[PDB]
């Protein structure tokens, strides 16, 4: 993964460097991260795990380690990443609504609204920026020395 | 270093504000809640802490009071 | 001014002389969100303080056109009015142009002299030999001729058709913080807010450095867009955003003021 | 005759000698008209005195600094240019400065003849090193604006007599800006803000009063041709 | 760390022109920077592992939608 | 676009006191790569300023291939130049070098085709001679009566519950996806969530915020967007049971 | 056709150019179309332009008018 | 210094246009003074221009009169060529009843006492034998330029057409600053200001009106 993570960023930068525009590697690395952050399964799991299924890292590892599977690193296309996203109402928003929504419905698949894109569609407070619980819940009292002074 | 007398909506300076909160995103709500309070005062229900102007906007009062350091916030 | 809300809603419909004195009072430091479709990046939207102007045109700032990617060849921009205290605040705090000088892409300043201001400041600062009122430093026969006690004296001399704005001249400077080597040589211990020192520059470069912040060291170099970018980037890295946001405004004012007397046709 | 909105004059204080005036609100194109006029009048018109030629006892042809001084001839020149003097002669008044021994040469160290007065005795002119005595003869005269140094066979045939560029102007540095004001249903009414850095000798309101005084007197002759109809304030 | 171990810059440094120059003047032809590609966050990314923001001119915010 | 209409007087004016009508920016020309307008401008000056060329006793070089009897021309002489068999490069250098005492016994424009202008605004002369001349300009249809449009509130659509599009129906202005992207790039959740609820959709929201603004009270927190009701009802119409659970406890309807 | 609304909203006002005591040949201009003055495609106007930057009012291919045009109705 | 009061000699080269010479002046002072004068002249001079016209035939600007060559629009555009002069401060009403065949000139108006039209050679409209042109014009005394005030908002009748009123008796104003005396022995500027009017008021009267205006603007 890491050499490809270098390669993609180098390659994406070189063509900007060529055209004269300059972007900061980390902005590419944010997308290349979003490329290299899933596993393809040849055949493993043995409980609600289909052979030949794209699976998220953290959720896979937790059941894989077995405290009480078998995954290899995969490189996925951005469309194939937004297609194989954890969310459903956003996946529906991108492409092939009926196909994914049918699967979502029978699966009873719960989206957390951690993604911004879904939380745009429903007219709700965007969780990004000024919409995290540490921001949206802030009690601002006037200071004890300022109160009596008025 | 050399402020060069800022005026209007750029007053008070944003750097002197940013220092009070952890990040600007905190400063936004940290102000907006005080703006929401001084909005309530006209109807906590604390009054304008810093000297209010002829027709100064609730926002500017909050930012002036945060610049004066008359408030504290709680990261939820 | 209006006896009843309905009567106010009539008076605003009739657009009577009594509303205009109020609209300044209502628009006083009340931000608006300018957006151009297609919005290609974050700086494609920016918040501003609306000044009230006559005519039928939105008077955009010349520095935010690099960001907006908006040529004045029939392009149109949307304005939005944030209503909630939160929206109004966030408009003032996050997306105010003065705050968003540097690119999210790199962190190079995008709100910088471009097209006109570049030629203006380039003419202003470019030191050209064989000019009027040039500092010669005559050898035993005559005085040095072209030395100046203050920038004021030089401005007085340049207002007369005697000294040209682009010439090697010897000003005595006080309010401008000297170059690192020059401070390191002359003062060492103390700075130079009140301390005086002699330069070998052009009145234009002095008039330009006059725009940049009191404590910032001296340039003594022609303002090529790369050098402007480097200086404004350095200033953005070293100083507060308000300081840079004023210095770039003075750079714009001076830039355009001198873009005329540039003689570029 | 015609009537308009009576222009206000307010005196914003920047520092001791330097100030800003605000003249508002002016009809569409009353800002620049009286603005640049006021600037050029403030800079040029007002009477004041200054050094025109100096003579430091030493240099006949010796281009290098005078032996037994810390400064250079140029530094002495551009320092002396700074010296602010007021003369009521209308004649090239010659005055001598002489000082000896170690330490500083203040503005107070000069001995002014009858009529002339230096308003800052505390300002610095030179720093004299040990085992040395500097003696300089300065020609102070009255004039207008800025005059470059010209050896027009007064200091031409002379062995030395260094000619120096004069700042007669009591007002050192004037700048100005115009701002559009919503006075009524009409906009683009120009509010003249005028930054004015003077010397210690005069007050900026005095300089402005003098400039105005010269301008009203200058336009008085045109005013007094016909007296047909004016846009009265 | 350099050839000897004369440690010039510690963990959690913004890497400004002074620091970048200092690392060159130290005499090292490589440095290990903390990026999003190696971030052990449950949801999204963690501030310190992104680096300083370009917009702010300071450490990236704990809200930023990088 | 007309950036500024200057009052007649504050306008770069000729030594004879004629104010120039328009000033087109120089930086545009070499970038845009259309010098035509400048030759068109130059010839314009030759067109307005009549020209009895004191040809010569043996003809000047520039007028070696001179066109049909085009040596003299009176004041405001309208000239034809076809788009290939037209006025040549160096011809205009000869055509500007042409005596035309405009009332006063002096020439305004020089051999090069520039003129020394006095600044109406400043009052000073420009320090170098600037390229003045007569240009044919076209009043274009892209008019503010077509383009300018505002809406605080107004008449809404029956089908969608967001303000209309167009000046005829007194519509709003379209807040697209790319604006939402930028709002989110700023991270201005409150602005976007205000734009996508009360400013567009929510029927209680718009009247409540109008009421709250005119009363001068706190803006109510936008709760229930019409879009979400539409999509919830629409998803429930396609036989998908969608129920929003809290962090802990029992689920709820929006109202 | 005196002040006829043309398809694109602009006016199609016509005027006579020729005098009473005047001979006219076949295929000659008699009337003045919406964009004719003595029978010639005249869409816009001839204006005295100056080419230079002017205090940032013309920055990025903007245009500066003399009120004279708006007053004189050119 | 040179303690010489500034002086100005009133001159004439034509009736419509005259020169003026101001001297002596402070070195580099002329251009600014000339500018101030030029600007004061071009902006603020009280002119007599047509405010509202009234034709009994046509109801509005975008129609035509029976038996005229040019229509009320181009008639209105031609009427702007009037250089009417009005000593009266109030709105004054003139009349024109040119009947039968012929060209209608600016001398054919019948003005009340203290209203004068100074270029009667100009061409307004051509009438055939069939046609009659009856117009009454309203002259008001203003300054600078005003937009054609609406007759809907104000309580004026359908008959009256507002016109683009230009209260500028001055036509062209320039200046040039002669060197006059070499650099040595106290150099002074002399400015020569060329003034050109509409033949409504004499250059001297306009210059005196400007001189009268801006002195009121200058406070001390
Ligand atoms: Mg375009
Ligand atoms: Zn991390």
UniProtKB/Swiss-Prot annotation, chain B:
Sections of the chain in a coiled coil: none
Keyword Nucleotidyltransferase among UniProt keywords: yes
Top EC class, one word: transferase
EC number, UniProt record: 2.7.7.6
SS bond list: none
GO BP, sorted A to Z: DNA-templated transcription
UniProtKB keywords: DNA-directed RNA polymerase, Nucleotidyltransferase, Transcription, Transferase
Superkingdom of source: Bacteria
A GO cellular component entry from the record: DNA-directed RNA polymerase complex
Any one Gene Ontology molecular-function term assigned to this protein's record: DNA-directed RNA polymerase activity
Catalytic activity: RNA(n) + a ribonucleoside 5'-triphosphate = RNA(n+1) + diphosphate
Keyword Phosphoprotein: no
Biological role stated in the UniProt entry: Promotes RNA polymerase assembly. Latches the N- and C-terminal regions of the beta' subunit thereby facilitating its interaction with the beta and alpha subunits.
Subunit description: The RNAP catalytic core consists of 2 alpha, 1 beta, 1 beta' and 1 omega subunit. When a sigma factor is associated with the core the holoenzyme is formed, which can initiate transcription.
Protein family membership: Belongs to the RNA polymerase subunit omega family.
Name this protein carries in UniProt: DNA-directed RNA polymerase subunit omega
Organism of origin: Mycolicibacterium smegmatis (strain ATCC 700084 / mc(2)155)
Gene that encodes the chain: rpoZ
UniProtKB/Swiss-Prot annotation, chain C:
Annotated binding of Mg(2+), by residue: 71, 73, 75
Source organism superkingdom: Bacteria
Subunit record text: The RNAP catalytic core consists of 2 alpha, 1 beta, 1 beta' and 1 omega subunit. When a sigma factor is associated with the core the holoenzyme is formed, which can initiate transcription.
Sequence similarity: Belongs to the RNA polymerase beta' chain family.
Role played: DNA-dependent RNA polymerase catalyzes the transcription of DNA into RNA using the four ribonucleoside triphosphates as substrates.
Name of the protein: DNA-directed RNA polymerase subunit beta'
Organism, as annotated: Mycolicibacterium smegmatis (strain ATCC 700084 / mc(2)155)
Residues of the full protein shown: 465 to 729 of 1317
Swiss-Prot record, chain G:
Disulfide bonds: none
Domain of life, per lineage: Bacteria
Homology family: Belongs to the RNA polymerase beta chain family.
Quaternary structure and partners: The RNAP catalytic core consists of 2 alpha, 1 beta, 1 beta' and 1 omega subunit. When a sigma factor is associated with the core the holoenzyme is formed, which can initiate transcription. Interacts with RbpA, which partially restores Rif-inhibited transcription.
Function text: DNA-dependent RNA polymerase catalyzes the transcription of DNA into RNA using the four ribonucleoside triphosphates as substrates. This subunit often mutates to generate rifampicin (Rif) resistance. Interaction with RbpA partially restores Rif-inhibited transcription; once the subunit is Rif-resistant however RbpA no longer stimulates transcription.
Other noteworthy facts: Mutations in the RRDR sequence (residues 423-449) confer rifampicin (Rif) resistance. Rif blocks transcription initiation but not elongation.
Protein name, as recorded: DNA-directed RNA polymerase subunit beta
The organism of origin for this protein: Mycolicibacterium smegmatis (strain ATCC 700084 / mc(2)155) (Mycobacterium smegmatis)
Name of encoding gene: rpoB
Residue numbers of the full-length protein present here: 664 to 737 of 1169
UniProtKB/Swiss-Prot annotation, chain H:
Superkingdom of this protein's organism: Bacteria
Record has DNA-binding as a keyword: no
GO biological process assignments: DNA-templated transcription
Keywords from the named record: DNA-directed RNA polymerase, Nucleotidyltransferase, Transcription, Transferase
Assembly: Homodimer. The RNAP catalytic core consists of 2 alpha, 1 beta, 1 beta' and 1 omega subunit. When a sigma factor is associated with the core the holoenzyme is formed, which can initiate transcription.
Protein family membership: Belongs to the RNA polymerase alpha chain family.
Notes on the domains: The N-terminal domain is essential for RNAP assembly and basal transcription, whereas the C-terminal domain is involved in interaction with transcriptional regulators and with upstream promoter elements.
Protein's recorded name: DNA-directed RNA polymerase subunit alpha
Lineage: Bacteria, Bacillati, Actinomycetota, Actinomycetes, Mycobacteriales
Gene that encodes it: rpoA
